Amino acid sequence: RHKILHRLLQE
Amino acid sequence: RHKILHRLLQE
Amino acid sequence: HMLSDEQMQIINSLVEAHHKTYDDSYSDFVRFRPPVRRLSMLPHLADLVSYSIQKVIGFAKMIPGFRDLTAEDQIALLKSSAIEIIMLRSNQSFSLEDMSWSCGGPDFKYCINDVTKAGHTLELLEPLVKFQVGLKKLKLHEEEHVLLMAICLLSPDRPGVQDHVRIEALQDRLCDVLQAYIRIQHPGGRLLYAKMIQKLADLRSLNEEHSKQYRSLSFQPEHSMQLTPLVLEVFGSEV
Amino acid sequence: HMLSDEQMQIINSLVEAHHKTYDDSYSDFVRFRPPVRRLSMLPHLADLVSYSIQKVIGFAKMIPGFRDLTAEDQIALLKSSAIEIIMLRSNQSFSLEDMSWSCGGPDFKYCINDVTKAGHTLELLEPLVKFQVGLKKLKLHEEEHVLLMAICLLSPDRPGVQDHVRIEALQDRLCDVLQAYIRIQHPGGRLLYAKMIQKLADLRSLNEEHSKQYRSLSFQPEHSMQLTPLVLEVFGSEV
């Protein structure tokens, strides 16, 4: 999961 | 699912 | 002919429910995230919509008959119709002069300009604005408006409805109360009912269109994170 | 002895990152849902916190070494430490006179009074406020503060960390840069390092306490619906 965290964590 | 809808829909 | 007790009752019930769920002062808007005139108007509008869903739910609970359906059907009906009921109730604040949704003040006057910065293209806004006007023109009565909303919401033909027979019964009773009203208490309203039902059809088109656009949005975290739990839940496609 | 190139570098990197993720003007607060002085201060604070998580994430991405961990470990570290990093960074706006979090104006001055109406009991606020002061007193330097945050965030002992060895390496390098700094560039700071690390321990207690309270909240829809997707996601316990 963690849709958001991923996006925010990507460059 | 629909945690919220349920609560809101209950008396 | 003339409306019966049971019929007038249903109207009083609905109209009162609408009143109990539609703040003509728009005082609650100051509580939303400030409107910012790149999807600048999404936070505010997302809050406005989430707020509207809440009212729609409360309106529903007050529709005689809705309360006795299975939570699954109530939810089915809500998720499927919510968006339209909102587009419907939103007309009650739409202006023809400035062609916008004026809600209390100038900081809550949504022009076609603003409405764009909410993540929605004109492929949606255009038909919507047209619906808003074609509807405004009908210059309906509070009872024809409140009824149309109730009818719309009690449409059995929604993906998810189990008991699409009881829901069918309720709506037919509602469809009548309206049909009757426009007859008895509505002068010059001979071709109205037709036009009104016709509107329910336009809503379906807008419903579909919004769903696509919204789906596109919800897939983008940087945007979905801007929405509210309630909105994500109701507009989200979780069976 | 004296700090080395690699060490000063790490500091410049961190301090600059902190600057790039901490708006000393607090201009963004006007964008949150208005503070309302029954959990009246939850919407605003939920937005304040969600905003803080966003900054914490951006700060992290800028910690030399964090960027090269597996997304799983970065996430593990974030979810586990986020809350503390926020309680840490929030001290940079805590006042001793009025004993509150003053952020730009009076409408953004959070007193122990306000902080209550956010859904949290004093069993949390009390230790938190104590932490806020014990920390304030240390009158740390931007570099000791920025470092403490980086260290805290790079704690390998968090439920979820895979590579709790590389994360162990990074933090040790960080722990040193600090230990060294307090030595060379910090007069009268002989017992500091100890006290600082001690703070990381207090944070754990506050972390635990908040988790319980938050868990209690998240189970109540009428409240969870008041939170933000980002908050629900980070504070939510989905493995």
- For chain C, which domains are there? 1-239 (1.10.565.10)
* Chain C residues whose beta carbon lies within 8 Å of the beta carbon of residue D33: 31-33, 47
Solved using:
X-ray
D130: tokens are 């104590």
Burial class for D194, CB neighbours closer than 10 Å (0-12, 13-18, 19+): exposed
* Chain D residues whose beta carbon lies within 8 Å of the beta carbon of residue A1: 233, 238
Whether the CB-CB separation of D39 and D223 falls below 8 Å is answered with yes
| Interhelix angle C166-184/C5-19, nearest 10 degrees | 100
Sheet of strand D100-103: strand arrangement: D94-95, D100-103, D105-110
Residues constituting chain B: 11
Give the C-alpha distances (Å, rounded to integers) separating C111 from C5, C22, C102, C141, C213.
43, 21, 8, 25, 20
Which residues make Cβ contacts (< 8 Å) with residue C211, sequence separation at least 6?
C83, C235
Q: Do chains A and D touch (3 or more CB pairs under 8 A)?
A: yes
Instruction: State the Cα–Cα distance between residues C83 and C231, nearest whole angstrom.
Output: 10
Least Cα distance to D206 among D138, D124, D130, D139 occurs for D124
Q: Which amino acid is at C200?
A: L
Say if the Cβ atoms of B6 and D221 lie within 8 Å.
yes
Residue of D nearest to C35 (CA): D31
Q: Do chains B and A touch (3 or more CB pairs under 8 A)?
A: no
Q: Pick from C28, C29, C31 the residue to mutate for testing the D interface (most D CBs within 10 Å).
A: C31
Residue of D nearest to A4 (CA): D230
What SS3 state is found at C95? strand
CA torsion through residues C23, C26, C32, C36, sign:
positive
Could you identify the residue written with the tokens 């999961």? A1
Say if the Cβ atoms of B3 and C233 lie within 8 Å.
yes
Could you identify the residue written with the tokens 């909102």? C86
Instruction: State the Cα–Cα distance between residues C151 and C149, nearest whole angstrom.
Output: 5
Structure's resolution in angstroms: 2.9
**C103 strand-pairing partners:** C105
C95: tokens are 């202006």
Which residues make Cβ contacts (< 8 Å) with residue D112, sequence separation at least 6?
D99, D100, D125, D129
Instruction: State the Cα–Cα distance between residues D9 and D174, nearest whole angstrom.
Output: 11
What SS3 state is found at D108? strand
